[PDB]
Every structure is written in structure tokens, then in C-alpha cells.
Amino acid sequence: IETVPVKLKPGMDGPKVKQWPLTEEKIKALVEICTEMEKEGKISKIGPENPYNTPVFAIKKKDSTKWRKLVDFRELNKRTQDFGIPHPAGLKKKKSVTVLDVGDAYFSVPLDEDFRKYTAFTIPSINNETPGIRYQYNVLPQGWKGSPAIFQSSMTKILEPFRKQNPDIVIYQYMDDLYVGSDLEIGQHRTKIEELRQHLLRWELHPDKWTVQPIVLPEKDSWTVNDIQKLVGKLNWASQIYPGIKVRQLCKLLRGTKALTEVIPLTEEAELELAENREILKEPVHGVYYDPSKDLIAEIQKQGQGQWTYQIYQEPFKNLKTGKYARMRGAHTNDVKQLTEAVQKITTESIVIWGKTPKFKLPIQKETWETWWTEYWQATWIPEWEFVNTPPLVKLWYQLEKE
Amino acid sequence: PISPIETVPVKLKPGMDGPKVKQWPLTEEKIKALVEICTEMEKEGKISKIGPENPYNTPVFAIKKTKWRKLVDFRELNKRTQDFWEVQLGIPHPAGLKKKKSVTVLDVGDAYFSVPLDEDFRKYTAFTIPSINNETPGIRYQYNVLPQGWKGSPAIFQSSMTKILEPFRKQNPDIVIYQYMDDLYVGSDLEIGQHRTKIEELRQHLLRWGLTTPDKKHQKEPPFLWMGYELHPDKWTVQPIVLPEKDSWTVNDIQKLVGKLNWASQIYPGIKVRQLCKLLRGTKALTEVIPLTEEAELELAENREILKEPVHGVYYDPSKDLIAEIQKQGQGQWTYQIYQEPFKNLKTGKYARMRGAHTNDVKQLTEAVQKITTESIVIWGKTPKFKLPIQKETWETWWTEYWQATWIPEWEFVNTPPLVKLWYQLEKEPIVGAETFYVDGAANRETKLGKAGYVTNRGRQKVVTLTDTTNQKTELQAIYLALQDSGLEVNIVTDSQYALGIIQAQPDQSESELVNQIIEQLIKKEKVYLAWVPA
Numbered sequence: 024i025e026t027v028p029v030k031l032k033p034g035m036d037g038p039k040v041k042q043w044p045l046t047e048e049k050i051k052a053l054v055e056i057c058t059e060m061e062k063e064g065k066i067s068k069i070g071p072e073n074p075y076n077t078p079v080f081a082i083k084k085k086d087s088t089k090w091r092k093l094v095d096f097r098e099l100n101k102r103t104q105d106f107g108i109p110h111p112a113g114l115k116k117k118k119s120v121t122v123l124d125v126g127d128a129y130f131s132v133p134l135d136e137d138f139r140k141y142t143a144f145t146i147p148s149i150n151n152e153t154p155g156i157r158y159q160y161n162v163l164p165q166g167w168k169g170s171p172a173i174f175q176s177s178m179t180k181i182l183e184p185f186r187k188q189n190p191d192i193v194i195y196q197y198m199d200d201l202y203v204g205s206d207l208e209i210g211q212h213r214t215k216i217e218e219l220r221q222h223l224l225r226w227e228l229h230p231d232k233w234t235v236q237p238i239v240l241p242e243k244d245s246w247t248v249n250d251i252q253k254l255v256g257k258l259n260w261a262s263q264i265y266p267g268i269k270v271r272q273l274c275k276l277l278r279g280t281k282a283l284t285e286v287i288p289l290t291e292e293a294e295l296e297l298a299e300n301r302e303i304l305k306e307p308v309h310g311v312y313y314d315p316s317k318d319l320i321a322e323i324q325k326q327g328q329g330q331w332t333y334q335i336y337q338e339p340f341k342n343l344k345t346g347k348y349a350r351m352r353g354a355h356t357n358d359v360k361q362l363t364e365a366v367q368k369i370t371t372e373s374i375v376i377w378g379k380t381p382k383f384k385l386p387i388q389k390e391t392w393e394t395w396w397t398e399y400w401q402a403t404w405i406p407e408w409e410f411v412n413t414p415p416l417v418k419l420w421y422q423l424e425k426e
Numbered sequence: 427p428i429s430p431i432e433t434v435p436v437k438l439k440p441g442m443d444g445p446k447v448k449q450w451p452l453t454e455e456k457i458k459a460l461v462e463i464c465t466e467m468e469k470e471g472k473i474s475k476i477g478p479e480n481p482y483n484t485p486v487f488a489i490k491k492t493k494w495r496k497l498v499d500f501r502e503l504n505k506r507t508q509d510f511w512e513v514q515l516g517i518p519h520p521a522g523l524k525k526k527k528s529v530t531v532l533d534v535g536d537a538y539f540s541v542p543l544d545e546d547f548r549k550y551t552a553f554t555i556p557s558i559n560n561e562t563p564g565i566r567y568q569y570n571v572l573p574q575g576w577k578g579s580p581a582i583f584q585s586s587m588t589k590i591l592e593p594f595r596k597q598n599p600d601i602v603i604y605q606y607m608d609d610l611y612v613g614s615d616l617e618i619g620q621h622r623t624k625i626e627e628l629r630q631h632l633l634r635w636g637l638t639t640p641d642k643k644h645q646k647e648p649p650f651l652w653m654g655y656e657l658h659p660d661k662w663t664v665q666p667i668v669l670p671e672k673d674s675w676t677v678n679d680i681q682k683l684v685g686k687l688n689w690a691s692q693i694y695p696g697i698k699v700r701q702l703c704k705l706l707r708g709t710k711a712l713t714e715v716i717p718l719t720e721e722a723e724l725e726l727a728e729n730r731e732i733l734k735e736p737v738h739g740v741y742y743d744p745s746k747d748l749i750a751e752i753q754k755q756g757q758g759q760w761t762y763q764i765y766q767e768p769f770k771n772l773k774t775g776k777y778a779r780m781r782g783a784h785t786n787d788v789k790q791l792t793e794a795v796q797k798i799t800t801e802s803i804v805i806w807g808k809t810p811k812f813k814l815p816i817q818k819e820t821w822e823t824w825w826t827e828y829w830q831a832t833w834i835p836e837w838e839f840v841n842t843p844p845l846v847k848l849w850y851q852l853e854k855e856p857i858v859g860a861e862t863f864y865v866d867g868a869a870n871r872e873t874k875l876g877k878a879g880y881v882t883n884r885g886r887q888k889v890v891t892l893t894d895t896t897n898q899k900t901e902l903q904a905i906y907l908a909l910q911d912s913g914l915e916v917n918i919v920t921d922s923q924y925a926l927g928i929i930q931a932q933p934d935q936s937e938s939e940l941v942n943q944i945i946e947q948l949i950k951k952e953k954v955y956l957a958w959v960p961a
């Protein structure tokens with residue numbers, strides 16, 4: 024099989040990202056994994072004249088004893104020429120969607136001779152009592168943007184029979200993944216999947232449920248100066264989203280220097296105002312649409328007690344989607360573990376709906392994140408991310424979301 | 427001899443061309459000495475007499491170390507040569523080496539000239555041997571091997587050595603080899619006689635590849651002086667650290683001193699440089715002489731005693747627990763020692779007080795834990811069990827409700843005061859029966875003229891006029907005034923966006939002298955409730 028000429032974007036030089044320290048347990052695994060890939064001719068050791076580098080590490084998603092190798096090509100991907108995969112809006116509209124890792128399909132296609140060097144990666148060594156073990160690819164590498172694109176013709180060809188046999192099922196491909204969606208009953212759905220698996224072996228999401236939860240202001244028997252002050256703080260800020268939100272009559276019940284604990288009887292005006300504000304918050308703000316030409320942003324706030332809120336958007340205050348995530352069983356004492364599952368969860372939803380990953384604003388310190396995230400990562404892909412300082416009010420606001 | 431190894435394909439940076447710098451003029455003496463040298467080299471196959479072709483050139487010099495030696499200046503060729511993979515710039519640490527019954531170092535110095543050079547790049551290494559004055563044309567040469575001083579030599583040589591050792595390593599994996607510069611450190615737990623035999627087998631193996639064997643004079647022995655340490659069979663130590671005794675100290679003298687002492691504060695428990703560092707105030711020149719105060723004298727006197735103390739580490743045993751204990755030496759300052767067996771430390775250290783915006787002890791502890799975790803993973807490929815001076819209750823109470831993702835790996839509590847804890851905890855709800863201060867602050871940001879004050883539900887009021895302040899400062903002072911004029915329980919209402927920040931993070935240390943004054947008041951109350959309301 025031939026090799027299509029692949030190139031870096033005009034003016035882009037290859038990646039030179041440094042390898043982050045790996046634990047001995049992980050190094051041993053990549054060594055084994057890599058030795059075997061070398062034998063199968065998939066990768067080759069390289070010389071010192073190759074200055075490029077991409078980080079690599081090892082994960083474990085489904086299987087237990089087994090280790091998987093995950094290479095972080097985000098940078099090379101950003102510098103790789105453009106081509107792709109068509110996104111079907113019907114995907115999100117399916118009762119059930121299952122993800123399948125078709126990363127191995129690429130080990131069959133050779134990678135352009137001259138582009139290989141840009142795939143250089145390094146297995147680190149403990150205490151540096153050894154030089155790193157350098158390699159580059161000979162075949163399409165997993166996680167690389169150009170892989171699914173080049174193996175595009177071969178994916179439609181092998182998928183067509185199943186798509187023809189079942190024109191009521193939608194199949195979407197992003198990176199190494201294949202998102203398969205249908206409406207069939209659970210059992211019939213899963214049984215229908217293996218049909219695809221078996222087909223593939225020869226070469227559990229539910230979007231409809233995904234609610235768009237609203238904000239719910241507190242309702243109380245009696246209101247204290249403090250209560251009003253707090254409702255007003257949130258309302259005010261929230262008016263950045265909804266301009267019909269007002270706090271005039273409420274703010275008036277604050278005129279005076281009363282004890283923070285004193286009960287204030289709501290006037291009828293403050294009541295209507297509260298009533299008008301509640302109606303307004305019964306639905307998402309009108310006019311927010313998805314714009315393909317812009318980047319999707321995912322912001323996450325640590326609510327506490329294992330709770331997290333997020334908002335996907337492209338323009339500030341114009342949320343395409345908002346939601347909440349409650350730490351899964353067992354992450355009780357690990358913030359970093361809850362945060363990584365949320366990112367994976369938010370990224371997967373994002374892929375399903377718009378076919379692209381969002382850029383995250385993570386409420387965690389860079390050092391904290393980079394030191395441990397791979398310990399819990401399980402996806403074949405990796406989103407972009409920056410670290411931020413959660414504004415006190417944004418958290419207070421979305422904490423109000425309805426349950 | 428030249429190693430029959432395949433060459434590494436080198437290139438010049440994007441488009442650039444070979445260097446052309448012109449030969450510095452030399453005397454008849456230095457020229458005759460170089461001709462001697464270059465003839466001996468041409469013979470060994472190292473370099474080659476070339477001709478008219480080559481447009482490139484590099485300046486050759488002659489230094490005396492006491493016979494004449496060559497010195498090619500490859501700076502220009504080095505600016506034009508492609509980049510190579512880091513020649514491994516990750517410095518190992520003694521605490522990471524696994525003990526070995528026997529370690530033997532093997533020197534491969536002139537090995538640089540033992541590895542051939544990409545015959546395609548050779549032209550770029552052309553240099554010239556001048557004629558007496560500037561008379562007739564000089565003799566011209568080119569390198570057939572890795573030139574000493576050229577950008578790519580260390581990397582290519584390392585790479586080359588690595589390939590050459592792969593066979594040997596395969597055959598005997600119970601042997602460890604560390605490649606550092608021109609040296610090979612070979613260790614093993616075999617019996618001395620067998621070890622010695624393997625060294626000779628290896629030495630013999632390298633000979634086969636044109637990588638010559640050192641003499642018995644050039645043969646180094648234990649302990650080994652490496653990157654500043656002394657590695658002994660059963661333990662490692664720090665080379666003696668000496669401090670210059672004088673009756674005259676210049677600015678430069680004191681800065682270098684402070685430098686060496688700050689370095690030593692890592693391995694040595696107690697080094698202090700406050701009094702010496704003070705001597706740098708208002709200095710006007712690096713050569714100015716600053717009389718050491720009494721205190722700077724008492725200090726520099728005490729450190730000398732400390733450095734005379736014996737501080738050693740131990741090596742790594744993969745079969746014992748990796749433990750790390752931490753201590754809060756002072757606000758924003760921590761000391762840590764990582765060990766396996768009690769009292770036998772593998773490594774130790776400290777993280778300096780980084781004066782910044784605002785944070786808290788549990789957070790800083792949390793960051794000290796992180797830096798150490800990354801350090802161990804790098805050195806031992808695993809994270810240690812932590813013994814921290816903070817209660818599981820204190821931790822669970824702080825982490826569980828903090829706005830930022832944070833985490834501490836597996837840890838235990840050790841009651842070695844001072845203990846790290848929360849200095850204060852703002853109330854969750856307004857305090858009943860506690861006065862409520864409605865504070866406010868305003869200042870003409872241009873005239874820096876403002877006022878700060880409050881009015882309480884109890885009818886208590888105040889207003890102070892501040893000369894030369896900022897909006898922020900008046901807001902914060904409004905709060906400060908409220909804190910100092912109130913009882914042990916206060917409710918405080920403010921519209922300061924900043925305060926909203928204090929509510930969320932509740933710092934116990936900041937860089938602002940004002941925020942710090944407020945923190946001290948906060949800490950002093952029995953209960954305090956801060957409420958923010960839009961302005």
C-alpha cells in the first residue's frame with residue numbers, strides 16, 4: 024500500500040514538547056508495548072538528529088491487567104495540514120450511543136516517509152540513569168489528526184455494508200473513536216453492536232436523556248436581610264444573561280442598617296419582581312446558536328461535596344449547554360479524579376453533539392493537574408485546556424440549577 | 427582508531443550555509459606546533475588535507491596547558507548546525523542510585539575523535555593553518571570525526587555509545603551502566619572477581635569498536651567525585667563546602683557568599699542569610715566594601731560550624747517503603763526529608779517563602795507535597811508515603827470545601843509541631859446577636875483622597891479620611907476598621923469585590939500589608955461573618 028504526502032501547515036515546524044516524568048510501572052509497560060511494536064515494524068528507533076518530540080504515557084480504560092499506550096499529539100495535530108469526517112445531527116437524537124475504539128485500524132497504512140520524523144516520541148528513564156528510548160512512526164499513529172482522514176476511504180468502504188444493512192443507525196467517527204447510535208431496545212441495541220464489532224474484527228450513552236436544566240431561585244417562608252442580599256447578588260450577576268432580570272424593589276427592602284438576621288416582610292412589588300425573575304429563568308436565553316467557525320469552550324466550577332457545574336459556550340453568557348456532575352462512587356477523597364471524569368464526560372457529550380472537543384477552563388493548578396490526570400484518563404483523545412480562577416459569583420449562580 | 431560505526435546524518439539549520447570566519451594570525455612558533463599536531467592527526471585518519479574547493483573556514487588557536495595544544499573555535503559553525511535531541515540534560519541524583527556491590531568507572535575521553543563524522547557535513551568543519559606572517563597560503567584541513575567543541579558531538583557520541591552497548595546490556599542485564607559525558611559507570615552485584623572479568627569483557631568489547639582503553643594512571647577510583655558529590659560504597663556525601671574567611675568583604679563577595687549559603691540551606695538544617703543579605707541594602711558597586719555587622723558576623727560564624735557537620739545520604743533499595751516527612755519551618759517555609767529506613771535519609775530539602783498575593787498554609791503544604799511527588803517520580807519512579815503535620819480532620823475540612831481542585835496522595839499524620847491548621851473559618855450564616863457593620867470605602871483615585879468607615883445596626887459609626895490611598899485600600903480599611911472596633915463576633919457587609927475573594931479562599935497570608943492586618947483581626951475573632959452585596 025502507498026503513502027499519501029502529508030505535511031505541516033505552511034510555516035509550522037514539528038513539535039518539540041517535553042516528556043513529563045512517568046512512574047516506573049508505566050515506563051516498564053511502554054517499554055514492553057514499544058518493543059513489540061518495533062518487531063511488528065510499526066515504529067523504529069531514531070537518532071539524535073531528530074529534535075522533535077511528543078509526549079507519551081500509559082493508561083488503562085476497560086481491561087485490567089493490560090496497559091494501553093496513549094500519545095499526546097495535540098501539538099502535532101495543531102501543526103498538521105488540514106483535510107475530514109462529516110457530522111450527523113442525528114447522533115444526539117439517538118436513544119443509545121456506544122463508543123468503539125478503532126485505533127488499530129491504522130496500523131495497516133504506512134505513513135509518508137518524510138513526515139515520520141514529526142512523530143518522534145520518548146520513553147523516559149528513572150533518574151536519567153539511561154538515555155530516553157527514542158522512536159518515530161512508520162504507520163499511521165493513534166491519536167494523530169491525519170490518521171482517520173487518510174484511513175477515511177477505507178473506513179467508509181468497510182462500514183458501508185453495515186450502514187446499508189441498517190440505514191436507521193448512525194455511525195460517527197472522531198479520532199480513534201466510532202460513535203454508534205440507534206433507537207433499538209437496549210438488548211437489541213447491544214446485540215446490533217457486536218454485529219459491527221465482529222464485522223470489524225475481520226480487517227453506553229443516552230443523549231435523549233441529556234437534560235438542559237434551568238435555574239431555580241430559592242423560595243422561603245421568611246426572608247432575612249442576608250437572604251435578600253444574597254438573592255440580589257446572584258440576580259444582579261444573572262442579569263448579564265437575562266436583561267429583564269431586575270432587583271430594584273428587592274434592593275429597596277435593604278435600605279437601612281438592619282441586623283443581617285432580621286426578618287424583612289416582602290412588599291407586593293418585591294414579590295412580583297421575584298415572580299417576574301422566576302418566569303424569565305424558566306427557559307434558556309433566546310438566540311444562542313452554535314457557530315462552526317468558532318471554538319467551543321467548557322468552563323467548570325468546583326461546587327463542593329463532590330459536585331461540579333459546567334457550561335459549554337462560544338460567547339460569554341450565551342450557553343449552548345450547562346449542567347452538573349456529581350463525583351462517581353469511590354472518588355470521595357480525590358478532587359483530580361472527579362475533575363478528569365467530568366472533562367471526559369463533557370468532552371464526549373461535546374463530540375456527540377457538534378463533533379469536536381471543547382477547550383476547558385479548569386479550576387485546578389497546572390502542577391496539580393499535569394502531575395496526575397493520566398492516572399485516571401481513559402479516552403483515546405485529549406482536549407485542550409487552560410487553568411483558571413473561578414469567579415465567586417459564577418459558582419454561586421450555577422449552584423442554583425434545578426434538581 | 428576510528429569506530430566502524432555508521433554516521434549520523436547532520437545538516438545545517440534551515441537554509442543557512444557553512445561558516446566562513448577567517449583564521450586569526452599566529453606566530454611562527456604556534457604555527458610549527460600546530461603543523462606538528464595536525465600531521466599526527468591526519469595520519470590517524472582524524473582530519474584531511476583538502477583544497478581550493480571548500481569556501482568555509484573556522485579559526486584555529488594554540489593554547490599551552492606545557493606543550494602546545496590545538497583549539498578549534500566552532501562557535502560560528504555551532505550557530506549554523508541543526509538542533510539535536512537534548513544530550514540528556516536531566517541531572518541524576520545520588521539518592522536515586524541503587525546500591526551495587528561494585529561500581530567501576532571507565533574513561534572514554536578522546537572517544538569524541540573515535541567516532542566518524544557524517545562525511546556529508548565534513549566540509550563545514552574546514553579550518554586553516556596559517557603561514558609565518560601572511561605570506562604564502564596556509565595548509566588546509568577538514569574533520570573526518572566528531573570535532574571537540576562542535577554542537578553535535580556530545581549527542582552523536584552518546585547515541586553512538588548507546589548502540590555499541592546494547593549487545594552487552596542484553597547479554598548481562600544484571601549489570602547497570604550509566605553514560606555520563608566521557609565516562610561509563612559500570613555497576614553490579616556480582617562477586618568482585620566476576621565483576622572485574624565483566625569489566626574486562628566490556629572494555630574488550632569497546633576496544634573492538636575503536637573506543638580505546640584508559641591507562642592505570644587515568645584510571646579513577648572510589649569514592650567518586652561526581653557533579654559535586656562523593657559516592658562511597660555504602661553511602662554518599664556532599665563535598666566539603668568552604669567559606670572564605672576575610673577582614674574585608676565587597677558587595678560581590680557577599681552576594682557570592684549568600685549564593686553558596688542559600689544553596690547549602692537544602693542539605694544543611696539551619697543555614698540563615700538574613701543578616702548577610704541586609705548588607706546589600708543601597709550598595710553602589712559590586713566592589714564597594716561593606717563592613718559586616720555584628721549580627722552578620724554572628725551569622726556567618728554559626729553557618730561555618732554547620733557546614734563542618736557530616737551530612738550523608740544513602741542509596742536506593744527498591745524493596746523498602748519510600749517515605750517523606752514534611753515540617754513547616756515558618757510561614758511559607760517548609761523542610762522535608764525522604765527516607766526508607768529511619769534516620770538514614772535518601773535526600774532532604776526546603777522550599778523558600780514565596781511572598782505572593784494570597785494563599786493559606788494547607789494550600790502551601792499541598793504544593794510542597796506536589797513538588798516532592800514530582801521529584802520522587804523523577805528520581806525513583808514512584809511517589810512516597812507522606813507523613814504530614816496536619817490532622818486528617820483539618821485536611822478533610824479544608825479540601826472538601828475549597829474552590830480549587832487539590833489533592834494529597836496517600837498520607838498519614840505525624841504530630842511533630844508546629845502543626846499546620848486553619849487560622850480561622852468564616853461563619854456559614856449570619857451571627858445572631860452579633861453587631862452588623864455596614865462598611866464602605868471611597869477614594870478619588872486621582873487625588874488619592876478618600877474616606878473609610880462603617881455604620882452598624884447598633885448605631886455605632888465612624889469615618890476616617892485617608893491621605894494618599896486607593897479605592898481598594900479604603901474598601902479594605904473600611905473592613906479593617908469594622909474588625910478592630912467590633913467584639914469577638916461580627917457580621918460585616920461590604921460591596922468590595924476583593925472581599926468576595928477573601929470569602930472564597932480565606933487566605934492566611936498575603937503580600938498586602940493591609941490584607942495582612944485584616945487577617946490578623948479575622949484570626950482574633952471568635953466568629954466573623956462576611957457578606958458581600960453588589961455596589
Ligand SMILES: O=C(COc1ccc(Cl)cc1C(=O)c1ccccc1)Nc1ccccc1
Pocket residue numbers: 523524525526527528529602603604611612613614648649650652657658659660741
Ligand atoms: O552502590 C553504589 C550505588 O551507586 C551506583 C550504582 C550503579 C552505578 Cl553504574 C554507579 C553508581 C555510583 O555510585 C555512581 C558513581 C559515579 C557517578 C554516578 C554514580 N555505588 C558505589 C559502589 C561501590 C563503590 C562506590 C560507589
